[PDB]
Amino acid sequence: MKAEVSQQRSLLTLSEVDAELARIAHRGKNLAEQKRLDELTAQRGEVNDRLAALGIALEDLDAQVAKYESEIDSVRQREDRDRALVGAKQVTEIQHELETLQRRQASLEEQLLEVMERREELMAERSEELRRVDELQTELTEAQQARDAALVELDQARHQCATRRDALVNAIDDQLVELYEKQRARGGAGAGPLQGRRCGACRIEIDRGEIARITAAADDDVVRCPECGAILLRV
Numbered sequence: 001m002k003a004e005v006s007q008q009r010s011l012l013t014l015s016e017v018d019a020e021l022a023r024i025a026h027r028g029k030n031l032a033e034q035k036r037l038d039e040l041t042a043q044r045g046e047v048n049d050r051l052a053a054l055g056i057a058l059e060d061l062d063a064q065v066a067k068y069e070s071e072i073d074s075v076r077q078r079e080d081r082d083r084a085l086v087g088a089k090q091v092t093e094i095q096h097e098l099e100t101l102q103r104r105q106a107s108l109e110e111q112l113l114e115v116m117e118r119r120e121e122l123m124a125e126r127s128e129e130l131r132r133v134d135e136l137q138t139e140l141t142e143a144q145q146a147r148d149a150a151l152v153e154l155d156q157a158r159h160q161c162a163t164r165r166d167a168l169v170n171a172i173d174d175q176l177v178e179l180y181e182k183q184r185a186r187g188g189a190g191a192g193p194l195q196g197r198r199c200g201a202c203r204i205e206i207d208r209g210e211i212a213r214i215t216a217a218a219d220d221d222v223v224r225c226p227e228c229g230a231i232l233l234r235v
């Protein structure tokens with residue numbers, strides 16, 4: 001197999017463009033902007049979970065408040081129903097009933113207050129978590145805007161290299177482009193520069209028996225690295 005040195009020179013730029021396209025794809029999956037978005041999203045979810053659990057607690061205290069202020073309403077009604085006063089003999093019995101009704105309302109007042117201020121404390125804690133999570137939300141959208149913008153730049157850069165690559169392939173004979181892409185299917189670079197003695201693809205230190213035949217090969221000949229099989233470009 002043989003190929004013009006000018007074709008091999010463009011095959012070198014073709015491998016470089018392909019190597020740049022690979023790192024462009026790699027950085028897309030390892031965006032620092034997404035790592036920042038991942039942390040803000042986790043933190044916002046942490047405040048969202050506490051806000052949800054705080055909501056359950058205030059429901060319980062609201063039910064306690066409602067049940068407490070449903071009992072005194074019957075006590076206030078029991079006093080109102082018995083306020084109508086007609087035999088004075090049994091009135092003493094209705095008078096001792098009012099003394100117990102007043103003690104039931106007074107004891108219930110101590111119970112409502114303990115729940116009222118405890119609910120007042122939780123809603124205060126709920127407000128500080130709302131401002132906390134709202135702060136994170138504004139940061140989260142900024143990180144999300146920064147993440148999307150970083151994806152646009154990578155896609156723009158990838159669109160560049162894809163155009164330069166298309167032009168390169170049209171400038172090299174299909175026979176050489178075929179062997180190159182057949183070598184990329186093996187998992188390696190497909191072609192690399194001979195960096196002194198070591199192949200530019202698999203980066204192996206080629207033995208001293210192969211470099212003699214490689215250096216002796218004609219300039220227009222194509223050479224494959226023994227270890228990996230990639231096209232070694234001496235130019």
Ligand SMILES: [Zn+2]
Pocket residue numbers: 199200201202203204225226227228229230
């Ligand atoms: Zn190699």
